[PDB]
Amino acid sequence: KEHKCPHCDKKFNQVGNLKAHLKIHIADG
Numbered sequence: 670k671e672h673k674c675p676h677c678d679k680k681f682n683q684v685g686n687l688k689a690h691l692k693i694h695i696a697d698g
């Protein structure tokens with residue numbers, strides 16, 4: 670687990686939610 674979001678600390682499974690997490694940091698969603 671090499672990547673973590675710097676602004677957010679909350680934790681969850683990296684399958685679905687992480688896709689959205691990274692995506693909403695690129696596109697405001």
Ligand SMILES: [Zn+2]
Binds near residue numbers: 677
């Ligand atoms: Zn984040």
